[PDB]
């Protein structure tokens, strides 16, 4: 169903935004890989529409960052999460458990 | 701002959704090109995030269309609208004026 | 069929390359829109795989050009051609008939 | 060079194709992740055009997989390979050494 796909995409996009926002709040050493994986994991957890949303938002973020005023590691972390593997694989010591 | 981008992308996504539900509600002959153009035009007016959102949602919709036996014509209508040209170029006679 | 899709993509990608090459040879005033439309038209003429190839190569070219050391017009011309409309719509007066 | 990019993309596309036909010829149990990883690794070694080609072909293949009732696992294997990690991490016991 198209409607269900679009619903999941909307939920997933909010998950990706929550990952961004948390990353900015945490302001933490060597956590970028974790939040990349967490955003994608959360979003794909919604279903195909969420996983689709994770993928295109991920690629846009990567693009804009190469429009800069370790991409391969970022994309690896994105897909680690998007495929359902535990984002805490990349968790740095000390990162508050709220994240 | 990335924030601004995601915000516009959120607005554009709602614009696209509005186009889909309007098309289904209208249930009008040969109206797909109009609603494709209209959703893309509404989305792109929100700004760059809006046009980006309209572009990726458009491509996901094309994929669906091709997998269910005119996606080429609708993608042309998508771009027409996204580029800021009048969606009413594609308006079929009799389509209710609220749409 | 996946094989047929991949075959068309290969043919289409050679068409897009032929459009680029011709554009560089022609070195002509205000022909960029024409070659954009012609590359995409030729490639989509091969079938879905060709049209798919036209789309992703088009977006890569646009990207790299925004990585610069009228995008919307370019993309409009791309989709004009990709949808099967005559690329000579954008032909500038004088352009050699080989192109 | 854009030329260099398209050249590497052509090489990468052949690498990906080699992976598909090898997978079909091998006809081996639980081997999809290996061949996904391998095709992406071969392609990305060609350079940026090669990695780009592997990325868009990978996404077109994911779409097909989802439309025919593990695409998530294969996309992870895609990224593993594309990032330069050893494809043989996914190698199933007994897969002929020529592959």
Do C52 and D60 lie within an 8 Å CB cutoff? yes
CATH number of the structural domain spanning residue B3: 1.10.132.110
Dihedral sign from CA coordinates of A44, A50, A52, A53: negative
How many C-beta atoms surround the C-beta of residue D27 within 10 A? 7
Question: Mutual orientation of helices D48-66 and D2-26 as an angle, nearest 10°?
Answer: 40
Query: How many folded domains does chain B comprise?
Result: 1
C-alpha C6/C-alpha D61 separation (Å) is: 10
- Quick check: D64 contacting C, CB < 8 Å? yes
Range of the domain at D89: 1-99
Do C64 and D5 lie within an 8 Å CB cutoff? yes
Residues of chain A with C-beta less than 8 angstroms from the C-beta of B9: 13
Residues of chain A with C-beta less than 8 angstroms from the C-beta of C66: 67
Q: Are B81 and B40 in contact (CB under 8 A)?
A: yes
Nearest to A51 by CA among A64, A62, A42: A42
Q: Quick one: DSSP state of residue A67? A: S
Query: In terms of DSSP H, where are the helices of chain B?
Result: 2-26, 32-45, 48-66, 71-82
Q: Which residue is associated with the tokens 């080429």?
A: B72
Q: Which chains touch C (3 or more CB pairs under 8 A)?
A: A, B, D
C-alpha C44/C-alpha C55 separation (Å) is: 9
C-alpha B41/C-alpha B56 separation (Å) is: 14
Nearest to B42 by CA among B4, B7, B87: B87
Nearest to C62 by CA among B28, B21, B52: B52
Resolution (A): 2.1
Which residues make Cβ contacts (< 8 Å) with residue A95, sequence separation at least 6?
A26, A28, A31, A34
Query: Radius of gyration (Cα) for chain A, nearest Å?
Result: 13
Nearest to C51 by CA among C12, C89, C23: C12
Nearest to C76 by CA among B19, B85, B66, B59: B85
The gap between the terminal CA atoms of chain B, to the nearest Å, is 33
- Quick check: C67 contacting A, CB < 8 Å? yes
């Amino acid at each position: 169903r198209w409607v269900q796909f679009m619903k999941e995409a909307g939920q997933g996009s909010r998950d990706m935004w929550r990952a961004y926002s948390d990353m900015k709040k945490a302001n933490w050493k060597n956590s970028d890989k974790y939040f990349h994986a967490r955003g994608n994991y959360d979003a794909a957890r919604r279903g195909p529409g969420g996983a689709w949303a994770a993928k295109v938002i991920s690629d846009a973020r990567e693009a804009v960052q190469k429009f800069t005023g370790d991409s391969r590691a970022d994309q690896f972390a994105n897909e680690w999460g998007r495929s359902g593997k535990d984002p805490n694989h990349f968790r740095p010591a000390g990162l508050p458990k709220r994240y």
